[PDB]
């Protein structure tokens, strides 16, 4: 089986009243995420992560001017592509809030979004020990990685 | 082949007060980790529950040692019906120098993860003096592993 | 099919005036990349994740050679290991400048140096949102993941 890597990264800055949404899951926090988009990081990384095991460039190459619309064409131009997903692995960097309990949520709507089960979806959550703009709470981070297959029928 | 992708991540702040614990290898030093705090080791356990779809460490480890916690971790992965091909981390440290103490690190790994030494990796980087990392405020771990879910 | 993963990481400091190099690239720009090679953050990372792979160690268990010579050198051992590579992701974070352009060119100086076909290389681009030194302009980041089969068969 013609076995492809991929991992992919991203940032965001927190910032006073605007929502956090995490995974496509909004969580309840006085700060929340800026970007160009609803700034998932998490589906984000995941997307580029995707786009990396087929070689098919980033996300800026494909999106440029919500993030689970993106995650769905990604895998729609991955599958066209010919490839298959395996699994995915994630890890989302906040000092807060606590996020296990909406890990869950995450893990469906990316399993959804990916035509996979649950049991090929994770998703893990870290603080980073009060260092950095990370551990001051100034930003929030993902990394995934991702598995796929060319076929090979 | 039923092949699954896990990466992991960890971090401590590094002070006077505790000794320096990577890959259970105690490195002699005047700093050490801060949380028994062993980035390295953590970072692999992650990972290995990552790859397994079993969430992460706070789902499964609420007086154990981190060694202790990797072993308990390789037990719920083989469990779960999965088999480890190898792993491959990284550890950030400005200082200092992890080189002659890498192969007690990979040692202390395969045994805990029932490996041979040769699917076992360890690396290590100085951050340049950049960020908290590099003015050895902290350490980090980064650590990819690939399993394989049987599939017998 | 025995696979394995490997991963790799390295950073440099920006600093004005000297030439800014990343995966054999040159890019103008006012800042260039400070270390005592040639300083290409996104070469290494793909060396290191290559050496880590193949369990061979690290860049420093290795090694007037750039860091072209060195990432051939890397596939030479980890073919002479029994190796074959499946294949190569990666991110760069700059803030700036844009490496769109430049990321063809990339990916052609990295297959080339691993004898892969282009569609086995990819090459990511991200900013870090202005957070950090990475942020400021003060470094520059590489990550990279790479698969390879231990034959084997
Ligand atoms: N230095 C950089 C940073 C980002 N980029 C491109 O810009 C797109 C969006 O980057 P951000 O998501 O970091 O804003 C990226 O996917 C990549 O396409 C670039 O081409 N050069
Ligand atoms: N923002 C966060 C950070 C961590 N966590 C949980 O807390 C546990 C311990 O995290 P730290 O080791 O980073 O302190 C994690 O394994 C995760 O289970 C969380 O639920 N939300
Ligand atoms: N704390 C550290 C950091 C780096 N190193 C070694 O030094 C080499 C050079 O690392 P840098 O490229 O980050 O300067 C690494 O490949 C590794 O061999 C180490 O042995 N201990
Ligand atoms: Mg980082
Ligand atoms: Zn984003
Ligand atoms: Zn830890
Ligand atoms: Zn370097």
Aim: contains cysteine.
């Amino acid at each position: 089986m013609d076995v492809r890597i991929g991992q992919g990264y991203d940032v965001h800055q927190l910032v006073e009243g605007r929502p956090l949404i995490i995974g496509g899951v909004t969580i309840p926090y006085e700060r929340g995420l800026l970007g160009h988009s609803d700034a998932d990081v998490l589906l984000h990384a995941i997307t580029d992560a995707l786009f990396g095991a087929a070689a098919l460039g980033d996300i800026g190459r494909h999106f440029s001017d919500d993030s689970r619309v993106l995650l769905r064409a990604c895998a729609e131009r991955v599958k066209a592509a010919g490839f298959t997903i395996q699994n995915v692995d994630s890890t989302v960097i906040a000092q807060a809030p606590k996020l296990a309990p909406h890990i869950d949520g995450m893990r469906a709507n990316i399993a959804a979004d990916l035509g996979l089960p649950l049991e090929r979806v994770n998703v893990k959550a870290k603080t980073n020990e009060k260092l950095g703009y990370l551990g001051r709470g100034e930003g929030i981070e993902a990394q995934a990685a991702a598995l796929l297959v060319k076929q090979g029928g």
